[PDB]
Each structure stands twice: as C-alpha cells, then as structure tokens.
C-alpha cells in the first residue's frame, strides 16, 4: 500500500544558530584564560567573588556556542522515531544566576532540541533579587519561540520552584535542567526514547564539567560515572559495577544508577505526579536528589543514566549562596526512607540528631500508599557494592584509652581522597567524629569509615606503628585485632598489644596489665 503521511513537525532545532565569529572566545569549548591586567583583572576577580563563576569571561563567550562532539561514536548510529516520541517541557528554575550563563542555557536548549519534540522551555524565577533578572530578562525573552517565564511570589527553594514549573507544564515529559548548562548535540532524543519505552524510567544525561574559570567543556566518550552516596548521606560518584555492565547490550545503552546527581533528568509528568513529585518540606538546596532516588527505586521505578545524552554543567568554585538546609533535608529523606539504617547516618553525622526537620507525616503516608519496598531491599538489590557498617553497641565512636585519660585514636590523612599510608596517632578527644570516628567490626578490623573508601588499621611487617590501609573483601592478617572485655587491643599477627605511648601514638608492645593497653569506645564525650 501507499506510504502514510508522517507526523508534521521539523526535526531541526527550534532555533538555528547565528553565524559564529571565527576567532570567537571559547568557540570550540576550549579553555580560555584571559591573562588580564589592572582594572580588567579586578573586574574579573569581582565577578568570581560575586558568582563563584568567572562571569567576566562568560560575558565574552557567545551565548550561542556549539559544544564539540564528544560522545561515543555509536551514539551517531542511533535512529529515533520522531513521529512517536513524546513532547517535553524543559523546566529551568533559577535564583540570582548571571545573565550570560542563564541565557546561554536557554539558547542552548532552543538550538539543540528538535522542534517536534520540544513543547516549551519554562523558566521559573525563584524570587531573584538581581536587577538584570527583572524587566531586562522579560524583555529579552519576550519574543523567543517556546519560552515561558514564571516568577515565584516569595523565595521557594529549588524543590518548590521546580514544582511551580511542573505545575505549569504542558508536555508529556518533564525535563529539568539547571540555569548554567550547555547541551551537547543530540541530548534530548535518547531521554525521550527511553521514557517512550518505559513510563516508569527516570532518565538522566551524563553530566559533563564546564569549568567555572575557563568554561572549557570536559565531556568525553568514555563510560560515565553513576550516582551513589556515603553514610554521611552525601552524594558521591562511582564507576559502573560489573553486574550492571554485563546487563548492558552495548556501551551506549542505559545504565541503572542508585542515585542521581540531581537537577538534570527527564520523567513522564504523570509518573512524576504518581510518585509524589518532590517533598515540599525540603528547603532551598540539598538532599532532594537522594530522597527522590530512594523513592524511585523503593516505589517501583528505575533510575538510569543514558550514555548518549550529554549535558555540560558549570560546577561553581564554591556554593554561590547559603546552603544551610541540606542537613535538615537529608534528615527528612532518612526519616522517611532509610528505616533502621538511618542510625548509621546519625552515628557519622551527629549534628543531624539536633536538626529540626519538620513534619514528614504526609511523606510517610505517601510511602504506605505506594506500597514501597524497604531500605534493606534497596541496599541488597540496587546498591549491593555499598559497604553497610554494623555499628555494634559499644564498638563504635571514639576509641579512648583508659590509662592515658581523655586521649583517643586519631587519624588525619593529608588528602581526604588518598587516606592510605599514614600513622594513626592519639589525640585529645573532641567528640566531633570524622578523624576520631572508628568502628570495631565482627571481622576484627578497626575501620575508619565516616566516608568511603573504608579504611582499616594495619601493622606492616616487623613494625610497631599503626598504619591506615584500605579495607578488603577478606580481612588481611595484619589488619586483625582482638578487642577483649577488659580493654586489651591484641594484634593477632604480631601477638602484641596496642599501648598508648609517648605527642602520643598507639604502639605495639608486649602484653601487660597496664591501663595504657586498655581501650574502650565512647559515642559521646559526656
């Protein structure tokens, strides 16, 4: 029979890119360092001090710059069925963003998103106070196709500002971006195609770095990192495990991720509403990405990173505004989703005990209504490579000496990332954890595991000092300690006892009845 007339719409982007100056700054996503002197240099310093981003430079980079091709070449082989893909509202909440970074985000979306797939770009002003975001912004956006600008009536925070955008959205799919992003070519089709296959998939781009000082684009074609967390409940990145890599049919297929970096993701609008959207009790910034990740997995969805979708993000030098609510937000997530495992969190971030977190009754009712699975399920099924501490009563906290009163084990690595190979010492107990937080485990190891990777105390061959190693699957012989009832700390391989010795360090000595060889755990100082 005769071919049917296809669905009408242009596959080309909503807007064409204007002509580029051949010598323009930052044109190919390269690093730019301007080497300024005098007053121009002071203006650059002031822009960094004011935005935590080199806005002096951003103001001199095109708002219409095309990112270089950086993805795996197999992504170019993908064919998409534009006639059947859903349409998306792109939602961009912003608070006091600079002019050039925000507008470059908008033009990037309009200049990379296929017209047939993009319903609208919704900007949500979260009660910004900067003047360039007022009448000047409305005037600049007023004529653009497929752009809406919505303004909050008071400071909402990113959660509730995003929900303002979602509430106004007209597309089938909600795609959230930050107000300082730049889209790789072809970023949108993979997300929409995946949601077209599975309504309950929340799908994230791989988030590439755009450097806040040079605006260099650092996307690459390798396997991306995926999202996890540690037991301080801070988001961390990790490498894709072998379990998940075996299940991928090609390198450019979607990858299941325990958690999301947050803020860049696509989701069916009906499914986002079905899952209870966002906890409206979270404030300002932080913690919502973890709560949303836990909710997605425990309540029956899938959270995935799509290797063919790349979005660059200007990670700032430091926090550009006060982020004092992340702890309370994380407590809301922990109290609703983590069950008994919230205690491992409270042990490693004791401030969380004191933090007011409001009323979570309605989120707990949401969890019951959706019949969600429990947190032990999430750990065993979604994130089994995360080590789960035991924190047995009497076996965690500060490791204090009986003889040398008020001194406890203390380990402070030079770099917080590289913890291996330095001596554990003794130090006046301060009760703040981190460097004085240890856990004695059922596998006889003394673990240093406020954050990951877990460190385990060891004694190298023929030495008397205590050195920080990494914990392994099977405890090596030089990491095994026996903590007896009376307090003796016996190193099995040396056949020696740990003794508080002269500053102060713990050293192996022959076992005696001395109190300087007696140790005990204390959770709190008083």
């Amino acid at each position: 029979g005769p071919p049917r007339t296809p669905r009408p719409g242009r596959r080309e982007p909503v807007m064409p890119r204007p002509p580029v100056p051949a010598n323009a700054l930052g044109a190919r996503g390269e690093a730019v360092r301007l080497q300024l002197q005098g007053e121009e240099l002071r203006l650059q310093e002031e822009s960094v001090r004011l935005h935590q981003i080199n806005i002096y430079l951003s103001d001199r980079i095109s708002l219409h710059r095309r990112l270089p091709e950086r993805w795996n070449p197999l992504c170019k082989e993908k064919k998409y069925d534009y006639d059947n893909l859903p349409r998306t509202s792109v939602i961009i909440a912003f608070y006091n963003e600079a002019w050039s970074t925000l507008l470059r985000t908008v033009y990037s979306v309009l200049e990379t998103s296929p017209d047939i797939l993009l319903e609208e770009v919704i900007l949500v002003d979260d009660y910004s106070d900067r003047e360039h975001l007022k009448e000047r912004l409305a005037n600049e956006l007023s004529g653009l196709p497929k752009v809406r600008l919505i303004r909050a009536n008071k400071r909402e925070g990113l959660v509730r500002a995003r929900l303002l955008g979602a509430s106004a959205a007209r597309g089938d799919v909600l795609t959230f971006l930050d107000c300082h992003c730049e889209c790789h070519e072809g970023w949108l089709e993979p997300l929409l195609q995946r949601i077209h296959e599975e309504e309950s998939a929340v799908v994230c781009p791989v988030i590439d770095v755009i450097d806040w000082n040079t605006f260099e684009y650092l996307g690459n074609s390798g396997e991306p990192q995926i999202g996890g967390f540690d037991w301080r409940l801070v988001f961390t990145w990790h490498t894709v495990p072998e379990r998940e890599r075996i299940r991928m049919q090609s390198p450019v297929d979607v990858i299941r991720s325990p958690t999301m970096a947050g803020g860049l993701f696509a989701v069916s609008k009906k499914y986002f509403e079905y899952l209870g959207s966002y906890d409206t009790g979270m404030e300002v910034w932080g913690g919502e990405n973890l709560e949303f990740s836990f909710r997605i997995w425990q309540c029956g969805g899938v959270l995935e990173t799509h290797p063919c979708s790349h979005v660059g993000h200007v990670f700032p030098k430091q926090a550009p505004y006060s982020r004092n609510k992340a702890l309370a937000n994380s407590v809301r997530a922990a109290e609703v989703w983590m069950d008994e495992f919230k205690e491992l969190y409270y042990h490693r971030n004791p401030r969380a005990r004191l933090e007011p977190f409001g009323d979570v009754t309605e989120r707990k009712q949401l969890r019951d209504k959706l019949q969600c699975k429990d947190f032990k399920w999430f750990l065993e099924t979604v994130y089994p490579e995360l080590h789960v501490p035991e924190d047995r009563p009497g076996f965690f906290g500060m490791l204090q000496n009986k003889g040398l009163t008020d001194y406890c084990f203390d380990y402070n690595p030079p770099d917080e990332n590289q913890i291996v190979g330095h001596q554990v010492i003794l130090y006046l107990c301060h009760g703040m954890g981190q460097n004085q937080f240890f856990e004695y485990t059922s596998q006889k190891e003394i673990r240093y595991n406020t954050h990951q990777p877990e460190g385990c105390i060891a004694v190298e061959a023929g030495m008397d000092t205590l050195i920080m190693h990494l914990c392994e699957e099977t405890a090596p012989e030089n990491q095994k300690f026996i903590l007896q009832e009376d307090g003796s700390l016996f190193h099995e391989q040396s056949k020696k006892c740990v003794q508080a010795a002269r500053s102060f360090v713990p050293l192996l000595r022959d076992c005696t009845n001395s109190d300087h060889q007696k140790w005990f755990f204390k959770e709190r100082m008083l």
Binding site: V209, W237, H430
Partner: peptide, 13 residues
C-alpha cells in the same frame, strides 16, 4: 579542628 556542593567527577573517568 573540625554537604555544601555537588561534586564534579574526577579527571580519571
């Protein structure tokens, strides 16, 4: 002595 930012990924991967 003694969560304010979203980490970037390392140059490694």
């Amino acid at each position: 002595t003694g969560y304010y930012i979203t980490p970037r990924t390392g140059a490694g991967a």
